[PDB]
With several copies, the nearest count.
Chain A
Amino acid sequence: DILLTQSPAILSVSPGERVSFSCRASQSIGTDIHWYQQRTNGSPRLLIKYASESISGIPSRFSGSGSGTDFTLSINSVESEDIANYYCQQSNRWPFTFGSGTKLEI
């Protein structure tokens, strides 16, 4: 089954800097990767779907890119509200799977 690797586990950045989260799939999955955000004690929240399609209601600050086995979630000039755990998820092959997640630290 597809394994989603998210490394590093923790990401430290300075306020307003640009940050990129990584997600590698153990096999080619086209652009069937989606991103979620989960704040402390919160529920996951769809950020990006199909690797780069912006979701309605998500700051323009958020963007996604990649295809095949390498995917990147980026945030332009991070800010306190972005402090959270980020997960990737694939829908290319059954069963759907999740990455281990990356923590954003300011």
Chain B
Amino acid sequence: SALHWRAAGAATVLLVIVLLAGSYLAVLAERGAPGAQLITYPRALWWSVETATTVGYGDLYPVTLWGRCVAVVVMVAGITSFGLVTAALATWFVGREQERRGH
């Protein structure tokens, strides 16, 4: 219904797709680079999650240009997503406070 709540969902589905494509593209970009560790899918997927949340533990990170490019899209999607929910939770709290007042 409400756009904000829709954008939230849109962004969660999207984030999930970026996480999945990100894991796949990461491996593709990193394999071929000596010393690269982001080279198998399961751990790449975990890597994408820790990147989107910005937790960063430093157990895995891209070392090639494309990998880092992929990393930037994942970070931006994660940050933009997680920040869009917050904006959604605000339009909700604000719309509900209006009632409890006089609108």
Q: Give A residues with C-beta under 8 Å from B.
A: 1, 30-31, 51-52, 65-68, 91-95
Binding site for A on B (CB under 8 A): 30-37, 39-40, 63
State whether B37 touches A68 (Cβ < 8 A).
no
A65 near B34 with CB under 8 A, answer yes
CB pair A31–B35 under 8 Å, yes or no, is yes
By a CB distance below 8 angstroms, the chain B residues around A65 are: 34
Set of chain A residues within 8 Å of B36, measured between Cβ atoms: 93-94
Closest CB in chain B relative to A68 CB, distance in Å: 6
- Per DSSP, chain B at the interface is loop
Q: Would you call A94 and B40 a contact (CB within 8 A)?
A: no
- Give the distance in Å from the alpha carbon of A95 to the alpha carbon of B40 in the complex: 12
Q: In this complex, what residue of A is CB-closest to B36? A: A94
CB distance from A92 to the nearest CB of B (A): 7
**In the complex, what residues of A have CB within 8 A of residue B63's CB?**
30
Interchain nearest-CB distance for B21 vs A (Å) = 21
Contact B34 A91 (CB under 8 A): no
Closest A residue to B40 using CB positions: A91
Nearest CB in chain B: distance from A4 CB, A: 16
Closest to B30 in A: A94
